[PDB]
Every structure is written in structure tokens, then in C-alpha cells.
């Protein structure tokens, strides 16, 4: 079969758009990320999600943002999606002030931590570096 | 290295704009 | 009883260890392509068909350019991790 | 031109960081399921449909039993990583 | 679109069945793995693959095995498949005599290394532990 | 621990046989 989409709403969709970083982190300004956030907003909104965009989120915000999101009631929701735009590194995404493991963000929706979404799809779209290797291509 | 710097700081970008 | 790790799906812009591209003028390769595919099939195709087409679009239609030679003509391929148990259609 | 990392598909029996179950009698869960689904739907469905079904089967029709409480009634979900750029059918 | 399957053959399916490991490694016997290999071979053969089953392979054999498989001429093949049955840990698989990172195994089929399989699907099925975590379940 | 030992050496099997 397929997931049951017979619910009031498709679901909540959170977009985290980190562009400017703290001088300390040494990370650069992600020019063109607003272009991605505007397109993603327009796109997922048309699919039917209730999209909210948060900018230059610190690591503390990102965690909370997702923790509280998982504390809500998705009983009438079909699924859930989160889009992360930021600098990154293997198993890690950058907040504005530091780095955060991707697994700590997603953990808020694991079983007992969000019974409302059990048996429902949890989508994480992640636009962030995962190292510095470059694909040279072939043929 | 410099190339490495730009990459670890995430400054390298596609210039295919033009 | 169901596994607590089930029903999660990750759509990464690049494979593990690599760099993810973007142009300050048009934005990320991954996003430009996700939006384009979703804009045309978001309501007709299954999640994996969509993402699979995004994989092809960014693989075939994108290639970098830079004044620096160490960053010229590079490529990229998205990575999809699925722990999903059913087909997913956005058409409610 | 295309990415060197494109067109690969990894069907892992379990998720990153976890143990992977097997029965000394009927073999491992992932393989038992992968096979039964392949026998039936192999010449009809697309691997993603195939593997998604496999994900469902080992997640609902399998739970462990152990004389040790540390390992009793545990569950398992497989993990599919995809870089394929097109749909895959084993047929024509 | 879908991958083109109009070739003389579907391709090669290599099965690595590791059941017994050297005393040193401390790794136990994988009972039930001969049933797996039997089922898999029977199954991938009917799909149309040219199945080859290898048993209790050392880390050297596994690398050599795959390197020489990637040096063959797959011009007339639709795809390639490889099934790994052994012990494992995060990012690594066991040989009878030790440990090998999975990336080094799959590397032999990357780009220039196997121009012959380019644009063709390379499938890796991996039945092996990825740590010692246990999923307790829910609801 | 015995639990961690049995796991790293992959000796923990499913007894749903019987």
C-alpha cells in the first residue's frame, strides 16, 4: 500500500534558513539561500504543507524549534517535513553560532517522543555540505 | 592552503550565472 | 509493535563526504531541481520517483565553473536515505 | 558528463548504529523478507517499491525472542540509500 | 524514465557468504547464513543474474574479488549486483581475518575505475550489523 | 558487560524458532 493521506491537513513543514553566521564560526555568507527558501516555500506550500520559515537560527533555536514541533499534536496531520539550509559537515549542520549533529534534531520524532506521528512519514530535506570532496565527473 | 580555506568556510560557488 | 527508527526519509543534497553546490544567482543545485520536479510532478508521482528524478536532473544538467581551476567543471549527485514502509503520494 | 558517485544503491539490512537480526533456523530477517518479496514482485515492481515493501515486512512480521531480557522482543528496520538516476525494473 | 535493460545479459551477482571467522577476531559463527546464501542465490538467479557464491572470504580475497570483477567487460550487461553477508560495525564489514571499510569495496566501481558500468545501476545489498544498538519498538 | 560482548561479537540470535 501507501501511507494514508486521509486527514484534515497534509502536515507541518519547517524551513530553517541559515545564511549569515557568527564571525567566530568563520563560516561564509550563503548568498542565494534566500532564493532557495522562497522557492521551497512556494513549492511545499502548493503541495499542501503549512510552511513556516525561520532565519539565521542558532543551534539552540534549531533544537527547540524541532523539539516543540514534535510536542504539538499531529493527530489530524498526514505527515511532517523539515528542510534545512546551511553550511555543513559529515553528520552535521551549522547553526549561526556553531555546529549540531543532524541526529539530535531528528531524534525528537523517534517513537515515544512523538506518538502523534507514529506510522506517518517524516521527511528531512537537507541542503548542506557533508565534507569538502569534489566530484570530478567522468566520460 | 587557500583552496581548502574557501571550501571549509563554504565560499566556493558556481559562477555559471553570467 | 513497530520500530522507532521506521518511517523516516532523508533527502540529502550530496553524497557523504562531498561538497554541495550553489550559485549566488540561482541558488543550490539540489533545491533548484527539487522545486522544478515537485512543481511538475509533486501531485502525480511517488516520493521516490520524484527524488529519483531530482537525482538525474542535478547529475545531468548541472556542472560548476570557477576562475580557480581546482573548482572548475565539477559534478554532484544527491543522496536519498529511506526508512519508509509505504509509497508516499502528496495527492490527498 | 556525470558524477562518479552516481548510479549506486545500498540496501542495508539495518539503520546506522544498530544490530542486525538473524535466526539460526531461517536466516536473517532482511534476507528472508528480501527474498519472499523478490520471488513474488521481482518481475513487476521497481526496486524502490520492492525495498519499501521489504522495509514494511521486517518491521511488522519480525520481533525477537531471547532467554535474555536484554535482547527480548526487539525490532528492526532496514535502510535504503539511493543515488540511482532512473527507475529500475528487472524485465524488458 | 527507467534504466535501459536491452542487453545480452542482466549482469553479474556476486555473493560473499562469511560464516566462520578466525579465532583471533573473536567474532562468532553466523548460524543461519547458509540458508540466506541459498535463498539469495536461488532468487537472483531467477531474476536473471549470473550468480557466483564465495565463502569465508579473507579481507584480501574480498578486495581482489571485487577489483577483478570491476576489471571485466560489462559492456553487454544491464547492471551489477553484490550481496554481502557477514559481521559488521559502523561503516565496515568483516572478512574472516579482519575488518574492511565498505567504501573501499564499492570504490572499485566508481567512475574511471569501471568505465564499462557507467550509467548502469550498481546494486549493493548488505546484511551485516552496523553497531550494537537495539530498536526496542513502540505502541 | 555480557550484553555488550555478545553483541559486538554478533552472537545474539533470534530464538523465535522453536
List the total number of helices of chain C.
Answer: 2
Q: Give me the secondary-structure category of chain C.
A: alpha+beta
What is the N-to-C order of secondary-structure elements of chain C (H for helix, E for strand)? EEEHHE
Percent in strands of chain C? 5-15%
CATH architecture of chain C: 2-Layer Sandwich
Q: How many individual domains of chain C?
A: 1
Q: What is the CATH class designation of chain C?
A: Alpha Beta
- Share in β-strands of chain B: under 5%
Roughly what percent helix of chain B?
25-40%
How many helices of chain B? 1
Number of β-strand runs of chain C: 4
Q: Biggest β-sheet of chain C: count, sense, barrel?
A: 2 strands, antiparallel
Largest inter-chain contact set: A-C, 52 and 50 residues
Q: CATH superfamily of chain C, called what?
A: Caspase-like
In the CATH scheme, what's the topology name of chain C? Answer: Alpha-Beta Plaits
Radius of gyration of chain B: 9 Å
Q: Can you count the beta strands of chain B? A: 0
Structural class of chain B: mainly alpha
- For the largest beta sheet of chain C, what order do the strands appear in spatially? 1-4
Shape of chain C: globular
Rounded radius of gyration of chain C (Å): 15 Å
Report a brief summary of the structure.
Chain A has 3 helices and 7 strands.
Question: Mind explaining what this structure looks like?
Answer:
- The complex is a heterohexamer, with 2 copies of chain A (139 residues), 2 copies of chain B (18 residues) and 2 copies of chain C (92 residues).
- Chain A has 139 residues and is of the alpha/beta class.
- Chain A is 24% helix and 27% strand.
- In chain A, the strands form 2 sheets. A 4-stranded parallel β-sheet of chain A has the order 2-1-3-7, covered by helices on one side. A 3-stranded antiparallel β-sheet of chain A has the order 4-5-6.
- In chain A, helix 1 (33-47) links the parallel strand 1 (9-17) and strand 2.
- The longest helix of chain A has 15 residues, at 33-47.
- In chain A, 42% of the residues are buried.
- Chain B has 1 helix and no strands.
- The longest helix of chain C is centred in the middle third of the chain and has 14 residues, at 47-60.
- In chain C, helix 1 (29-41) crosses helix 2.
- Chain C has a two-stranded antiparallel sheet. In chain C, strands 2-3 form a two-stranded antiparallel ribbon.
- By secondary structure, chain C is an alpha+beta fold.
- At the A-C interface, helix 1, strand 3 and strand 7 of A face strand 1, strand 2, strand 3 and helix 1 of C.
- Strand 4 (79-82) of chain C pairs antiparallel with strand 4 (79-82) of chain D, so a sheet runs across the interface.
